[PDB]
Design a protein around this ligand. Structure first.
Ligand SMILES: [Pt+2]
Ligand SMILES: [Pt+2]
Length: 94
């Protein structure tokens, strides 16, 4: 699909680019980096809930510094249990 998927990936990127200001011409520069470091074979991109659960945990575990779980439960409005599960998740993914 890539002639078409990469084409879509490009338009989406230059939209979000100009959206954040950045000149919409650096999109192609970004599509190249994604494909260059991520490419090789095929990957299954999650759709709904699986994706949404991951985005939540990614946001949480990226704010974790090793000792701020209390701060994370307050910033994200979720329970200690939810935060610890996200953490255990960065850890498990190899
Ligand atoms: Pt790489
Ligand atoms: Pt880590």
């Amino acid at each position: 699909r890539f002639p078409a998927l990469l084409a879509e990936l490009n338009d989406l990127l230059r939209g979000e680019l100009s959206r954040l200001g950045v000149d919409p011409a650096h999109s192609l520069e970004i599509v190249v980096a994604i494909c260059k470091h991520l490419g090789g074979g095929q990957v299954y991109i999650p759709r709904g809930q699986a994706l949404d659960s991951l985005i939540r945990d990614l946001r949480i575990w990226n704010d974790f510094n090793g000792r701020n779980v209390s701060e994370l439960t307050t910033r994200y409005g979720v329970t200690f249990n939810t935060v610890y599960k996200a953490i255990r998740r960065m850890r498990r993914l190899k």
